[PDB]
Scaffold this active site. Structure first.
Site, short mmCIF file in Angstrom:
data_model
loop_
_atom_site.label_atom_id
_atom_site.label_comp_id
_atom_site.label_asym_id
_atom_site.label_seq_id
_atom_site.Cartn_x
_atom_site.Cartn_y
_atom_site.Cartn_z
CE1 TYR A 26 -22.45 -25.66 -12.38
CE2 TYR A 26 -23.89 -23.81 -11.96
CZ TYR A 26 -23.69 -25.07 -12.49
OH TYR A 26 -24.72 -25.74 -13.13
CG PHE A 36 -29.70 -18.15 -12.59
CD1 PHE A 36 -28.67 -17.62 -11.83
CD2 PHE A 36 -29.42 -18.60 -13.86
CE1 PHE A 36 -27.39 -17.56 -12.35
CE2 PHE A 36 -28.15 -18.54 -14.37
CZ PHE A 36 -27.14 -18.02 -13.62
CG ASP A 37 -28.72 -21.38 -14.18
OD1 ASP A 37 -29.90 -21.41 -13.86
OD2 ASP A 37 -28.27 -21.22 -15.30
CB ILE A 56 -24.02 -20.77 -21.72
CG1 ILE A 56 -23.16 -20.83 -20.44
CG2 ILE A 56 -25.51 -21.09 -21.46
CD1 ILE A 56 -23.66 -19.89 -19.35
CE1 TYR A 82 -28.72 -21.25 -20.94
CE2 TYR A 82 -28.87 -19.53 -19.30
CZ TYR A 82 -28.65 -20.85 -19.62
OH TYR A 82 -28.37 -21.77 -18.63
CG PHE A 99 -22.09 -19.20 -13.86
CD1 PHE A 99 -22.80 -18.40 -14.71
CD2 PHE A 99 -22.52 -20.49 -13.63
CE1 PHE A 99 -23.93 -18.88 -15.33
CE2 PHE A 99 -23.65 -20.99 -14.24
CZ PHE A 99 -24.36 -20.17 -15.10
#
Length: 107
Positions: A26, A36-37, A56, A82, A99
């Site tokens: 992803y 960020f991720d 998560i 989160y 995502f």
């Protein structure tokens, strides 16, 4: 409070099961800011299991809900992401996560 907006469906027969290890790739983006991720493939995607609270919820539920060979755009809200608050480093407070995942295989 997570949603699953598929783009390229998968077979529609296999999903992550209880006792499997998802193999997903992803890219994490935010509402309209930046990443960020991310899972910078270069050094192998990401791999996790169902039922061992390592990722998560938005995922756990989201990814599950996806099938082997499918790609989607999931939207996660604090409740699942989160919690309520995060970090002033990766997860600013109440900053919804987005995502775009591709479930590749199960191991």
């Amino acid at each position: 409070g997570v949603q699953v907006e598929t783009i390229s469906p998968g077979d529609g027969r296999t999903f992550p099961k209880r006792g499997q290890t998802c193999v997903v790739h992803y890219t994490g983006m935010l509402e309209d800011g930046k990443k960020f991720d991310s899972s910078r493939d270069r050094n192998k995607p990401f791999k996790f299991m169902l039922g061992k609270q390592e990722v998560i919820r938005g995922w756990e539920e989201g990814v599950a809900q996806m099938s082997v060979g499918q790609r989607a755009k999931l939207t996660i809200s604090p409740d699942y992401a989160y919690g309520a608050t995060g970090h002033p480093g990766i997860i600013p407070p109440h900053a919804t996560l987005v995502f775009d995942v591709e479930l590749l295989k199960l191991e």
